[PDB]
Structure formats: structure tokens, C-alpha cells
Ligand binder design. Structure first.
Ligand SMILES: NC1(C(=O)O)CCN(c2ccccc2)CC1
Ligand SMILES: *[C@@H]1O[C@H](CO)[C@@H](O)[C@H](O)[C@H]1NC(C)=O
Ligand SMILES: *[C@@H]1O[C@H](CO)[C@@H](O)[C@H](O)[C@H]1NC(C)=O
Lengths: 201, 202, 203, 202, 200
């Protein structure tokens, strides 16, 4: 198979509205934020404006093809794929996607989608000008899929990606799995809590 | 039935432009705002900038399927469903939807749509710096469907969802049914009046 | 007929690009602005930022159905209808539509479209802080249809709709028919001239 | 023929990607800016924010119909027509189109497209507060079509269109044909140079 | 062939989602930024707001036609072509395209796409008020195609720059580089554009 045939097959059979659950087991979505920049911080309003790469991976076996004498990977517009309905629960702006809306699909049906996103959050900015710094917690999970349909799995150098020219510096980035239950709904929603420990230079 | 079949059936037959009225009775829409944040307040201009979850529920029987050996619920893009044409009558900005535009559809045809919205309103900001606080009234109803086609009923801890990091705190949220009539339009439009009693901290 | 059938018929035979002129009629468009709020005013730049409901009515007989044992009215997305190409001749921003883009269609083919619009205008802001107040004139007409294809007529109670919480108050709103001809364009374009007489409140 | 038939024919057979060159001669595009407002001026940064009507005319014979017992003109969405790929070479913002995206097509295939555009430019703002005023030059031509495919031809005092309520006033507008050539690329690109001589009011 | 036939053929057989690799060799994309304006500079935040023409060329043989008794070139909307998924790695705003989204296609299948882009970057603004000036580095490469699928090669400076800018350009150097991250085992080719400029 060549790229043209694989991309034709994916475009024609996609089902972007269909979560690719296998035998009633959840789709395992891995999420990791790579912080690139901290653009604006307000200790009064407890608001941060940040740029991060939202590394997102999951498996969709309906995309898979025989890799023998074929590419191992193709670039696919996300309009042709099911994508996790991830939201930042404490976002106060729409995610502004800075990059081409393409994901990498591996021949086994693994999808790697890593948009660069600029977004504003409501989080703890207190202590940003101290040596301990602020710890801003960003919570990311499925908006409509509970633990039986989507699970969020949090799994090196925090400053490998971070701009040397930022007014701020990153002390630590921790990612923990959590679960939130709401009075509307008997179901638990999995999220990743991203703790951004940072300070002014 | 599996998810793929249910979502295929809904996409093919949903009729998103068709209000799902049963036997000439109005579609009962439940609306409840869960306030998440108050970002900006201006006592001079009487303007607030707020983030809320607009919990919206109604029944569309044309979406229903046999739940035996099937999912009880699916996630559906709102472009594939009829959705109430709700508007805030005192909004001064477009609703900025912060979340994926998906609704939950139950096998009985109940729809749950809860977007996170950031929006600016013209309302009473007077007394925001006092202990009694300001009471900002937000009116939400159908833009084009009158009382015979859509009824809007409020569903109802106010601060269960509210950000601990806001400069403001919520004293009380009351959500009451009302109606608006204008000279333009001979019909009554049902709304939910949401009274946000809040104040600056410290 | 039920709602589903009427909306199917409109969606399937909807020619949204086709002005519904009849034999020896222009399409008669009624326009009336209901001011809801005045958000920002600049006496230096002569700019206002306003929210208004643009009450718009006209007839499209191709939408009509037999009302016997049928709804009298349906809600239709404007993407499925011809809509007048109205523009504010002195607008300095794109109209920001704040409301769902649905119109009401009556069984006789009358269309009622009333978007809530936020828009900025270049107009006379001088005297906004006085008792007489400023008079800001907004001109709205068809961008491309002249008097033989579209006529614009004003449809009236000014302050029924206006926010009590505005920094400003409305003294008077007058809406009068006018016509503009420019040297560019040999035809006359009908407009509604909306005179917004308003002032700042005391603090 | 009625309007519905003409607009059907144009929608079905309009090749919007195909420049309507006749017998290997360039498409003659007429361009004239009618200034409506000057909203913001910065003498430090040499930037202006302006509103103008971009009067644009050209012929596309593939649109033509027999005018006998038919309309002489129809309104056509520009998505259904070939339109010149005009750009302002010294623009520092995207053209913000304030008007419905419709052109007028005459039965002989003449197209009149006149959008109202708000756009920011890098140009000479020096002397804006003097009696002689600033002269801001705006250059408009085809982005991708050279002189053999598109020619750009200008069609006084802009007092007829200019807002009496502007902080600024127009002293003179001159619109002259020019060409830009780069050393990289052997073809000339025709432009209209629009000299906006304006000043702040006393 | 006339323009109508060429544009019909391109529109119909346009696979815009398909990188036009020939025998598993990378598509060679040439990139050169022509700076037109520097609008805003902040030495505190290390942010610049710039306007540039992103001269982009590559070959797509599926677009090619016999030039005998035909046009040598046509203008094609980029929605009808494969276009490189180029991104500025240090951009802090979406590229704002100021120009009509058309490319030039030559009869041999060479594509010339040169949008005017306004974009904000995080880069070294230190020394902007000195005689040596600031050196702001902008890195542009494929977002999803590694070195085996796309190569980026750089191609007179200040022929294009606005005389009315508060800033002036001392030098522009454009050099090939490669970036590898711990996340991702593949190397991504970029062009590093060093904009040496200062306040007047
Ligand atoms: N497609 C163009 C290229 O060759 O790269 C055609 C020439 N061009 C241009 C830009 C502004 C003014 C005149 C020509 C760049 C795009
Ligand atoms: C749904 O299907 C099941 C299994 O075929 C059947 O037993 C059940 O009665 C059906 N429910 C209804 C409401 O018809
Ligand atoms: C236009 O009208 C003339 C006069 O009758 C006629 O001869 C000609 O064939 C007509 N054109 C078309 C396209 O029918």
C-alpha cells in the first residue's frame, strides 16, 4: 500500500463521531503537556496565559493497515479521525491551536496528536515572585465520556521544550491521574491533573 | 446495537432543524447555570464577564433505541441533534463555548447538553464591594420558540463548581421561571431568570 | 402537514441566493432597530459600540404552505432562506450576531428575522455629556439591491427594550426612510436612517 | 429568463478558479478606493487604520445572458464567481470585509464587486497634524497574476463618501497605475498606487 | 490545453492530503522569509510582531501537464493542492495570512506559494536599542513530517522591508537545522531565520 491508498481508506471509512471502544473496554487516552511558554500571569486575578504541546495518544484499530511494503506512519487531518473530547475544566479561554490540525497514525492504529495550544487558566498564581514559586493546577479530561468509555493515563526533562526567553522558569511539572464525580451524574470522569510549579526570573 | 449503529441511526434520521414536539405539547427544556468563575466586573458600566456550565436537558423520542444488550448513553455532536435555540436576553457578547460541542443522549431519548460558556452581561453590579453583594440577573430563553413550542423550567451547593481562586465569592444563586413579551411579537417567550448574588473577597 | 414536512420542503427547494421578487414588485423589507445597550462611546473619535435587535420582515411566497391542520409558523435556519443583504453604511466593525441564526416563517411566506447585533459606528457623539445629548445617525439598506429589487421601510416605542443598567439613557429614536445615490453607482439605494438621541447619566 | 434561472446557470457553470482571459489578452481589472473613515493613526509607528469601499470591475463573458425580457443585473455570491486575487502590498492586517460578499453581474458579463473593507497599513503618517497633512500610499495589485494575465487600471477629493464625523479630513486622493518587479522574478505585477493626503482637524 | 482544462484536472485529481513523495525520497521544500515589517517589539517579554512573505517552493509531479500550446503556469487555490504543514516552532500566535490563498503551479509540477503572514514570536529581543541590534531566531519546519518525508532547504535582504518601520534590518541569515526531542525518535528539518534588527 502507498500513502495515497492508506489516506483514501482512512478518509472513506473514518467514523469520526464513533469512539473506538474494543469489547466494551475504555479507550486509553495518554495526555502529557509540554510547556513551551508562560506569556502572562496575574497574581490578583489568579489567571495564567500559557503555550503547551498537548501530547495525546490512543489506539483506533479501525485505522490499522498491513505495514509490509507500506509506510509505518501517515499524517491525517483530525477531521478524518475520532479524537478524544478533552477539555481543561479550569480553562477561561477557548484552546487556540497554533499548528496544522494533523495527527500521526501508525499502521497498528496508534494515533499521536500533539497540537501547540495557547490557552488561559484560572489557577493558584500565589507565590509566583517567591523562590518556591506558584503551583498552577490544570485539569484535563473527557467532557462527555465517563471511566467506562475513556480512561486518561498521565504517563523526562520539564525544561527540554520551555523557551529560554520566557520571563518565567519551570521548577517542576507533575502529572497525577484523578477522578471527579458531579451531583448531576452517578459516573466518574477521569482527568489528568498537571501541576505547573514555576516562578518569575 | 453497538455505538457505531446508534450514532449512524441518529446521524441519518435526527432532523436537527425539527423541534421534537409531541402531540402539539411544548418541548420541556430544563436549564440550570453552574457558575465556575467571575472574571471581570465593572460597577460603572454594570457589566460582568462570567464562566458557567449551561446544564440543558429535554426529550427527543426520535433519538430513542432499545437499551437491551446496547449502551444506555452515547456522545453525539450537537450538529447531529435538534438543540434548543437558547439565548441570554441581556448578553452583550457572543457565548464563547470552551468545551467540545457534544451532548449525551440516553436510550429513552433524553438529551443532556452542558457547554462551558464564557459570556459578558449587562446587569446590576451595584453593591459588589458590600457584604450584601451585587445581584446580577441573567435571563435565558428560546430566541424563536414561544410558550406553545418550548417551555423553560429551572432544574433546582451553589459553590460546588465555583473556582476557589476567583477574586469573587457566591452568596446565593436563585433560578426562577418567568416570561417576556415585547411589542414586536404577540407571543410570550418563557425564560429562566438566574439571580447571581456575589461580592468581592476581603 | 407537520413541522418535519414543512422544514423538509423548505430545505429541499430553498434557493437562498434568489431574491423572491414577483412580477412588478420589489421585495418590501421592513427594518426597525430596538436598542438594548450602548456599551462604549468616544466623543474624540466619534465612535459608538451598540447592541440592538434588527427586526427584519419580508415576504417569500416560495416558502408558503396550506395552514389548514398545519403549524402557522416554523423556525428555519437562515442558511435555508434568502435573507436581505442589509449593511450599515457607517459601520466600522462587522455585525457580531449574538443570537441563534433562526428566522420565523409564517404559512403565508412572511419571514421574521430579528438577530441581536453588536456593532461599532462612525456617527456624531458630540454633546453626549449634555442634557440635549448626542444624535448618532445609523443608515441601514441593501448593499447590492437597488429600489427596483428591494424597498426598505421603517416598521414605535424606543425604551421598551433598553437596559436600565446602561451608563447611557435614550432620549429619542426616530427611524425614517431615505435614499442614497453615489457617483460610483447609477441606481438609488433605499435605506432606513435611525437617529439615536442619547446621553450619559449623572454618576 | 428570470433571476432564479440566471443564478442557477451561474452557480452550475461558474468556474471560480478560472481567470476569464479572452484570446490570450489580460483581464482588465478597474480598482478605485472610496475612503469612508480614518479610525486610528500613529505618527510614531507609521500605521493607519482605514475603512474604504474597494470598487472593483472586470468582464467575464462566461456569465453573460440574453437581457431581452430578463433582468439586466443579478446579485451573485463571490464564491460563485472568479474574483481578482487583489492584495494591498503594504497591509499589516487581513482585509476585514464589513459588507455581504455579493457582486453585481450585468447581462453582458461585467462584474461590479465593491466590498467595504477595514484594514491597517504601514505608510507615511509624518505631517498628519500639519496643514499640508500626511500622504499615505496604499499599493493594490494581483498577488499571483502578472501583467500578461491581469492589468490593474484606476477608474479627486473623496468628500462624497468620507464621514463628516471623522477626526480626520481628506485633502486629496490620487490613484495612479504602477508596476512592481523583483530581481528574482522576470514578470512585472501591475498595481494601483493610492495616495491618501489627509490631516487631523483643528 | 487551456487554463480551464488544467484547473479542472488539478481540482479533480488533487489529493491535498497526500504528500507527493517520489520513490520514497523526501519532498524538498525551499523556504525563505522576506521581512516586510516589524510592528511591535518587547525587550521585557522577548516577543516580536512581524510581517513576512514566506516564499515556499516544492515539486508535485501529479500537477504536471504538457506545456506545448498551453500556459506555462496557473494560479490554484491551496485548498486544491497538497501544501507543506510548516509551523514556526517558537510562534506564540496563529499565522495571520494577509493575502489571497492561491499558489502558482508551473507545467513541470513546481509549486510557488508565497503568503504574506503576520505572526508573533518568542525570541531574543535583547540589544534592540543598541548598534549591534537584537538577533531574533525564527525556526520553521514540518509539524508532522520527519526528514525522510520532508526536507527544508533555505534559498538582497531589505529589498522588501518597509522604509516606514521604526526598525531597520542589519542582517537576515537562513540556515538549515534539525530538531530531535526525547518524545519522538525522528529528526525534523527546519530553517533557522536569524533576524538581526534594531530601533532607528
Ligand atoms: N506565487 C508567487 C511566487 O512566485 O512565489 C507569485 C509572485 N508573487 C508576488 C507577490 C506580490 C506581488 C507580486 C507578485 C509571490 C507569490
Ligand atoms: C427490546 O428488545 C429485547 C430483546 O430482543 C426485548 O425482549 C424487549 O422487550 C424489547 N423492548 C421493547 C420495549 O420492545
Ligand atoms: C438572443 O436574442 C436574439 C434575438 O432574438 C436571438 O437571435 C439569440 O439567438 C438569443 N440568444 C440565445 C442565447 O438564445
Amino acid at each position: 500500500l502507498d500513502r495515497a491508498d492508506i489516506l483514501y481508506n482512512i478518509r472513506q471509512t473514518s467514523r469520526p463521531d464513533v469512539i473506538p471502544t474494543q469489547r466494551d473496554r475504555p479507550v486509553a487516552v495518554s495526555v502529557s503537556l509540554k510547556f513551551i511558554n508562560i506569556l502572562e500571569v496575574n497574581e490578583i486575578t489568579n489567571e495564567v496565559d500559557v503555550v503547551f504541546w498537548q501530547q495525546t495518544t490512543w489506539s483506533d484499530r479501525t485505522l490499522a493497515w498491513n505495514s509490509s511494503h507500506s509506510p509505518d506512519q501517515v499524517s491525517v487531518p483530525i477531521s478524518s479521525l475520532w479524537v478524544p473530547d478533552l477539555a481543561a475544566y479550569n480553562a477561561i479561554s477557548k484552546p487556540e491551536v497554533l499548528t496544522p490540525q494533523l495527527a500521526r497514525v501508525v499502521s497498528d492504529g496508534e494515533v499521536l496528536y500533539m497540537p501547540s495550544i495557547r490557552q488561559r487558566f484560572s489557577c493558584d498564581v500565589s507565590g509566583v515572585d517567591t523562590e518556591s514559586g506558584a503551583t498552577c493546577r490544570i485539569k484535563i479530561g473527557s467532557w462527555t465520556h465517563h471511566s467506562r468509555e475513556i480512561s486518561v493515563d498521565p504517563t523526562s526533562d520539564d525544561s527540554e521544550y520551555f523557551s529560554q526567553y520566557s520571563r518565567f522558569e519551570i521548577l517542576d511539572v507533575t502529572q497525577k491521574k484523578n477522578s471527579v464525580t458531579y451531583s448531576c451524574c452517578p459516573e466518574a470522569y477521569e482527568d489528568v491533573e498537571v501541576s505547573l510549579n514555576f516562578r518569575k526570573k
